[PDB]
Amino acid sequence: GDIYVSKLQANQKSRYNELMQALNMSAALTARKTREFRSPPQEQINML
């Protein structure tokens, strides 16, 4: 679990950086991504 959560943290950081630098930023997709990233940490783990 420790190694897996480290990997998931790195990948979530990469995904957030990609979302920030997103040319085709759809309003619905952007809102969904913001909701997913702006969620309680337990909810983020459950989603992952």
Q: Experimental method for this entry?
A: cryo-EM
Here the tokens at position 40 are 């309680």
Q: DSSP strand E in the chain: where?
A: none
Give the Cα separation of 1 and 5 in Å (integer): 6
The C-alpha R_g of the chain, in whole angstroms, comes to 12
Q: How many residues does the chain have?
A: 48
- Data resolution in angstroms: 3.2
User: Phi and psi for 25 in degrees, rounded to 5?
Assistant: -90, 90
Tokens standing for 43?
A: 């909810």
CA–CA separation, 21 vs 17, rounded Å?
6
Report the alpha-carbon distance of residue 42 to residue 19 in Å, rounded: 21
Tokens 């998931």 — which residue?
A: 8
For residue 42, CA distances in Å to 12, 18, 21, 24, 48 come to: 14, 23, 26, 29, 10
Cα separation, 13 vs 26, whole angstroms: 20
Other CB atoms closer than 10 Å to residue 11's CB: what's the count? 11
